[PDB]
Each structure stands twice: as structure tokens, then as C-alpha cells.
């Protein structure tokens, strides 16, 4: 049993990544109201806890952080804001957990569209790092492999 958490600002692609991982968009319909909606099997069982849609309720984020074991800090390369917002979430994880270090990975979603890219590639490497894309299936699974290793 494993509990991974996906974090980041709205419009960053959190929900797209989560569905793309557990099941896949279009190929199957997605029902988020049944038991196995966020649980996949990879050789172990993962449950993805995503703060998508619930960004305004920061008590939801904290509950997921508390129950989490791995953390995906997703930013969008389309917007500058979204990378900055990762500073606070990085801190907030440590505060709820009460630990020195926690297994986490940085993610730079929306890497497929590069005629709108306003974020550099090495900025994330200074702060595990991947430059993923949900709608182009790039690195989607790789993200959640990292966290089980750590």
C-alpha cells in the first residue's frame, strides 16, 4: 500500500496527470466516485491523492499531505506563477508531516507545447526532477515510479 499526493496551482494539469496515470483519458470513461478510482497496481498498490478542484479548501490539501508518503509538485511551463507557488507547498508539506525530509518529485507539466513556454528547464533541477506532459503521455508513469523507489 502506497499513498502519493499531487500538488500545484490550478490549471497546472494535476487532474489530467492523475486520470492519465490510473486509467487514461478517452480510451475508457472515468468514474471518480467508485472505490478503485484513484488506485492502480504497479509490484504494489498506489492511491493517488489529488488536490485538483479542491484548491480553495486548503484543509483538503493538509489532510492529503498528512496521509501522503510521496509528493508530486506539479508546475506548468505555460505560466510563470505556477513555478513560484511551489516554494510554499514545499514548506507546508514539512509543517504537516513534522519531518526533516520527505520523498518528493518535481514536475514541469505541459512540456508538449513549446511555442507558449515561459519557463526554463534547469530551474527545477536546482530545487528528483522530470519535465512531464499529461495530454501527450510523456513521463506520466515515470513520475509515480520515482516516489515508490524513495
Amino acid at each position: 500500500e502506497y499513498k502519493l499526493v499531487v500538488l500545484g496551482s490550478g490549471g497546472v494539469g494535476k487532474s489530467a496527470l492523475t486520470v492519465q496515470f490510473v486509467q487514461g483519458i478517452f480510451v475508457e470513461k472515468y468514474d471518480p466516485t467508485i472505490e478503485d478510482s484513484y488506485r492502480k497496481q504497479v509490484q504494489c498498490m498506489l492511491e493517488i491523492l489529488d488536490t485538483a478542484g479542491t484548491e480553495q479548501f486548503t484543509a483538503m490539501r493538509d489532510l492529503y499531505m498528512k496521509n501522503g508518503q510521496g509528493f508530486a509538485l506539479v508546475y506548468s511551463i505555460t505560466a510563470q506563477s505556477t513555478f513560484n507557488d511551489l516554494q510554499d507547498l514545499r514548506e507546508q508539506i514539512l509543517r504537516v508531516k513534522d519531518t526533516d525530509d520527505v520523498p518528493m518529485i518535481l514536475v514541469g507539466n505541459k512540456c508538449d507545447l513549446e511555442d507558449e513556454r515561459v519557463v526554463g528547464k534547469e530551474q527545477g533541477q536546482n530545487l528528483a526532477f522530470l519535465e512531464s506532459s499529461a495530454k501527450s503521455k510523456i513521463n506520466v508513469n515515470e513520475i509515480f515510479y520515482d516516489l515508490v523507489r524513495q
Binding site: 499513498k3 487532474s15 489530467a16 492523475t18 486520470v19 486509467q23 483519458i25 478517452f26 470513461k29 472515468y30 468514474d31 471518480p32 466516485t33 467508485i34 472505490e35 478503485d36 478510482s37 484513484y38 488506485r39 492511491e47 491523492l49 489529488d50 485538483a52 478542484g53 479542491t54 480553495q56 479548501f57 486548503t58 484543509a59 483538503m60 493538509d62 489532510l63 492529503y64 498528512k66 496521509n67 509543517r95 504537516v96
Partner: protein, 632 residues
């Protein structure tokens, strides 16, 4: 010879007749995907039909389906009233299955295209025992060599995808006016009636409804034609009544929908006069028309909203609730007489700023609890700083609510929560999920209710952190655990979870000296409350708790919004340019869930006044700092 054999009644065919037919059924395309067992049964059931003259009607639209057909020679036209020959089937093709399986009227007429056409036929009782649960073939309805409606066994065939026009057409034709099937009919129409704004807005639906209302049949004797036209008009009215009920008071926000309805009532009452019809439906239609010409907030309601300047002076603008950010800028630049390129930013008590898009609608209620709205040129963005007003109270209110009954507080909370929850219209959940700007409608009522969760949560945190006396702070934690328990008893699970989440807040869970000396009974009371929030197996703990309860209950709102979000984001609205109606049903089901929770009603003025006028700190930094100097 084969003709004669295939023309004999089912129970008059010899063993050698049956044996010759079967050997020929193996060449037939339409039957290829069937088993030996099935083909042998069909051998003693398939009837040979022949018609000589083109233009001969095989069956008419609106009739009850009695047969399934396979074309051996020739071709037929699929004809629909008000559209004519919509597509044409050839030798090898089959038709008429949909009406048989769905026990529904014929959606179209089948007319012989050419002379001398040969058919194989299977009648309804024979079709149902032999073929019904073997023929899984997706029913595709075609117009202009294009899929226009797709149906599947999800037993009936349900709409999977299709054009907005054909989906409406389908849901019109299948309405049953038979009075004992009242709630069954309303339930079927409910998916479309609620979801139409996503794929077929009123600007399209209303003309399409009028066009359908006046659609006359293009075939049959005078009586046949009059009977069909009358029931068509009865079905259109039925759908209009469901459409008008769904909206209710929201119609006032749509001019096209109101113009339509006002004209439609005139059109119906005139038809009622001279045809002597619609005896029951006309008073229903009149009741709804006359009603046109905490309380729910309307999008046309007027707001006096303060929009702040960098120096913390402000303009009071007077605009509609559903006004766009662009309309807000225009109203501010009016009173400040400017053309200096204003942008609207919303800001936290924490100082966190967000630039709002020009086409964002109804932003006034999308503010955080202590959020304010600002107008400035872009070069001022980074120099903006919060107002003192935003930083919340500095002394607590324990000396007031501590004197109040835990039971009284919980009850008054749920009364207020219910008024707020009933202001939320079913469609506001739709607008919120698919995006406010696409509908240009307000979700003000939903926004204010969702805000209440954050308010209650932060109310807990505020009162604890402004309570310096450790002895009385333990009495606080005890009282909040009590209020939560009572809230959970009234089935107000929203306020319940909000208090529990307030108690688990980083600033509150820190206070070990407060938690340690809390009575052991309440320590376990809270640990049970905190295990109901367990996000395991898709919040299984909560989901089962909520399911066991009975209708009059307030759900855990953030999870409902989460469900809605992932339903939208994980499913595509359009599939091959056809409306993914499978997705529409899912969103509708989640909304009907809210309808179920409010299907039953609910069962100390100073306590009412406190609960409704909360003063909260929503600045987590400030709340941590206060907590750090209560217990370092």
C-alpha cells in the same frame, strides 16, 4: 420455391424446409455474427416479404415497432417528418431494431426507394426470445452519411453520443403521456433538460422546440395525421414543462428563454381553444408563465462593491452580480474617469495576488473570506499590500459563545447551512464545473456556501489561537468536539468535517499541552472523527457514512466539487464531434445526488446572530504566529 418456403407460417415449416432455409441463411451478411443455435431458430421464424412498387410504405414514424427487417433486393429510404429522406439503406442492410428493443415508437418511416424489393422479416415476440440478447450491434442512426445518434446496451439501448438536434429529437419521441408513467417519463427527460446548456443552449433549443411543435406528418389518412400532430404537440409541451421546472426562477436571466415561453404559451392556448385539447397541460403552462411577470441571489441583482486602489482608497461601483471583469473595469474607470489601463486583482489577507481575466464573470463571491478586490495598472501589481480590514479580529469571542449551548450552536449552524444550501440551484454546479465564462451565468449561491466551509474551519482556528489561558483553551477544544458531534447528528456532514479539519489545523494540532490535558473520553471522540476523513479507497469512510443516512442531509462539499471536477476533466465532452452523452449522464447523476439530499425538509435569537456573523482570521501565517506564542 425458396420464396414459398419462407412465406409459410413458422409452425407449418417441415424439417426439410427448415434445413434448406438454414443453408441459405449462411450467405446472409446481417446474420453472420450469430451462432448456429440462433440461425437454426431463425430458420423457422424468418418471413419472406415482397413489394413491387417504389414509394410503398413499409412502416410509419410514430407507430409501435412490430418487426425487424433485412433487405435482400432493392433499397429503402429512411424518412423523417420535417427533414425528408435522411438516409438510404441498400441490399445487405437491416433496420427497425431500435423500436423493438426499446419498446419505443418508430423514429422514422421506411419507404421503398426502387421497384421490386425483397425483405426478410422477424416479428416482435419471435425477435425478443431469439435475438434480443445476442444482437448487441451498436445502433447507429445516420443522416447525410454521418453518425447522428449512437445507442448501446449499458435491457434498453441508451444514448451514448449524437448531435444536439438528434438527442432532442430522440428524447421528444420517447416521452410517454400515459398518466401512470408520469415520474418515469420525467426521469428519462431529466438528463437532457438539466444538461442541455453544455451542448445545446437556449438560443438553439427554443427555435428547435418551436420547429418541432409545428411539425406536421408527411403521410397517412387525415385522422392518422391529426392524431400524430396532436400527440407531437403534447410531447413538446411536456418537455417544455420539464425544461421550465428545471430552471424555475432562473428563466428571468435569459431573455430568449422568456420570449420563447411567453410566445409558446400564446401558441398553445390558441391551439387549445380551437382544437379543444391540452385540458390538463394548459393550466400548468399558465402557472409557470404568470410567475415571471436567506433568499437566492440572482445574476441580475445589483451589488454595491468596493474596488480598492493602491493607496487603500476605494470606488464603490454599482453593477449586476453576474457582471464580467471587463464590466467591472468599465465601472471603475467611469468614476475615476480613466483610460490608464486598469487590471482587476484579488488579494488575500496573506498578500497573495491574482490577476483576473477580462472575461471572468461574477468574481465578487469567488473572493477568499477576507479577500478584497483591487484595480491598478500592471506596474503597480507587485507593490500592492493588504488592508488592515483583511487581517481579522485580534481579541476572541469565547466570552460569548462559551455561554451558549453546544446543541444550540450546532442547530443554529445547520439552520443557516440549510438556507445557504437551498439557495444553490442544481444548474450552478454545472456552470461551476464547465466554467462560468462559457455560460456567463452566476454561481454566487454556490460560492457563498462553499465559502462557509472555509469560514467554519478558520473560525475554529481563530478562537483557539486568540485564547491565551490554557485552562479555557481545553474547554474550547472540548466544546468544538461537542459541536461537531451534534452537527454530525443533524446530518450536517459539511459543518462537521469543517470543525474536525479546524481542529486538525497545523496551528491547533501543535498545542500539545492543550491536547494532553483534554479529557480522555474526548481524545478518542476526536480520533474517530479524524478517521472518517481517511482518504483511503476513495474516501470510503465518509462515502459509506453518507450513504447509510437518510435524505435531509448536508454532504461533504469539497468532495462533491472534486467528483464533479474529475468527471469533467477525465471525460471528453465531444467524441468524433458528437456529444458524449455518457459524460452528461455522469454529471447529471452527481447533481441528482444533491437533489436527493434536499428531498426532505429540516427539523434563541442571540445564538442565531453569532453563528451568522462570524469574524475569522484566514491568514495561516498569523494563526501560526499566535499559536507559537501560546505554546512556544
Amino acid at each position: 420455391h425458396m420464396r414459398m418456403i419462407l412465406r409459410k407460417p413458422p409452425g407449418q415449416r417441415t424439417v426439410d424446409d427448415l434445413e434448406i432455409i438454414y443453408d441459405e441463411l449462411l450467405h446472409i451478411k446481417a446474420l453472420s455474427h450469430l451462432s448456429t443455435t440462433v440461425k437454426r431458430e431463425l430458420a423457422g421464424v424468418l418471413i419472406f416479404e415482397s413489394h413491387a412498387k417504389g414509394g410503398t410504405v413499409l412502416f410509419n414514424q410514430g407507430e409501435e415497432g412490430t418487426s425487424w427487417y433485412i433487405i435482400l433486393k432493392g433499397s429503402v429510404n429512411v424518412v423523417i417528418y420535417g427533414k425528408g429522406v435522411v438516409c438510404t439503406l441498400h441490399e445487405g442492410d437491416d433496420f427497425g431494431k431500435l423500436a423493438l428493443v426499446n419498446d419505443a415508437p418508430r423514429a422514422a418511416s421506411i419507404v421503398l426507394r426502387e421497384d421490386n424489393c425483397h425483405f426478410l422479416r422477424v416479428d416482435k415476440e419471435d425477435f425478443n426470445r431469439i435475438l434480443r440478447d445476442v444482437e448487441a450491434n451498436t445502433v447507429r442512426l445516420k443522416e447525410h452519411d454521418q453518425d447522428v445518434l449512437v445507442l448501446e446496451k449499458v435491457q434498453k439501448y441508451t444514448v451514448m453520443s449524437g448531435t444536439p438536434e438528434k438527442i432532442l429529437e430522440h428524447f421528444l419521441e420517447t416521452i410517454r403521456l400515459e398518466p401512470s408513467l408520469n415520474e418515469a417519463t420525467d426521469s428519462v427527460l431529466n438528463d437532457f433538460v438539466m444538461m442541455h446548456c453544455v451542448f445545446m443552449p437556449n438560443t438553439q433549443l427554443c427555435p428547435a422546440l418551436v420547429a418541432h411543435y409545428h411539425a406536421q406528418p408527411s403521410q397517412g389518412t387525415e385522422q392518422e395525421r391529426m392524431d400524430y400532430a396532436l400527440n407531437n404537440k403534447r410531447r413538446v409541451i411536456r418537455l417544455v414543462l420539464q425544461w421550465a421546472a428545471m430552471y424555475g426562477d432562473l428563466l428571468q436571466e435569459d431573455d430568449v428563454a422568456m420570449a420563447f415561453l411567453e410566445e409558446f404559451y400564446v401558441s398553445v392556448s390558441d391551439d387549445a381553444r380551437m382544437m379543444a385539447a391540452f385540458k390538463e397541460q394548459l393550466p400548468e403552462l399558465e402557472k409557470i408563465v404568470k410567475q415571471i411577470s436567506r433568499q437566492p441571489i440572482r445574476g441580475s441583482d445589483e451589488v454595491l462593491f468596493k474596488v480598492y486602489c493602491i493607496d487603500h482608497t476605494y470606488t464603490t461601483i454599482r453593477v449586476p452580480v453576474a457582471a464580467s471583469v471587463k464590466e467591472v473595469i468599465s465601472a471603475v474607470a467611469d468614476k475615476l474617469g480613466s483610460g490608464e489601463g486598469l487590471i482587476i486583482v484579488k488579494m488575500n489577507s496573506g498578500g497573495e495576488k491574482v490577476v483576473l481575466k477580462s472575461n471572468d464573470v461574477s468574481v465578487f463571491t469567488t473572493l477568499t473570506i477576507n479577500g478584497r478586490l483591487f484595480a491598478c495598472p500592471r506596474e503597480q501589481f507587485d507593490s500592492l499590500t493588504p488592508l488592515p480590514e483583511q487581517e481579522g479580529p485580534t481579541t476572541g469571542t469565547v466570552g460569548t459563545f462559551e455561554l451558549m449551548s453546544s446543541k444550540d450552536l450546532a442547530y443554529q449552524m445547520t439552520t443557516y447551512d440549510w438556507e445557504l444550501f437551498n439557495c444553490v440551484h442544481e444548474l450552478e454546479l454545472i456552470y461551476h464545473t464547465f466554467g462560468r465564462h462559457n455560460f456567463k451565468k452566476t454561481t454566487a449561491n454556490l460560492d457563498l456556501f462553499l465559502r462557509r466551509f472555509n469560514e467554519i474551519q478558520f473560525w475554529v482556528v481563530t478562537e483557539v489561537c486568540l485564547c491565551s489561558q490554557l485552562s479555557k483553551r481545553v474547554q474550547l477544544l472540548k466544546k468544538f468536539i461537542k459541536i461537531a458531534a451534534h452537527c454530525k447528528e443533524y446530518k450536517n456532514l459539511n459543518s462537521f468535517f469543517a470543525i474536525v479539519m479546524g481542529l486538525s489545523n497545523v496551528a491547533v494540532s501543535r498545542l500539545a499541552l492543550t491536547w494532553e490535558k483534554l479529557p480522555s473520553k474526548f481524545k478518542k471522540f476526536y480520533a474517530e472523527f479524524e478517521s472518517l476523513m481517511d482518504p483511503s479507497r476513495n474516501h470510503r469512510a465518509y462515502r459509506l457514512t453518507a450513504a447509510k443516512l437518510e435524505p435531509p442531509l448536508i454532504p461533504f462539499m469539497p468532495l462533491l466539487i472534486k467528483d464533479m471536477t474529475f468527471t469533467h476533466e477525465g471525460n471528453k465532452t465531444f467524441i468524433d464531434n458528437l456529444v458524449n452523452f455518457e459524460k452528461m449522464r455522469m454529471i447529471a447523476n452527481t447533481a441528482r445526488t444533491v437533489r436527493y439530499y434536499r428531498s426532505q425538509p429540516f427539523n434563541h435569537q442571540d445564538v442565531r446572530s453569532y453563528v451568522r456573523q462570524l469574524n475569522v482570521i484566514d491568514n495561516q501565517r498569523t494563526l501560526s504566529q499566535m499559536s507559537h506564542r501560546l505554546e512556544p
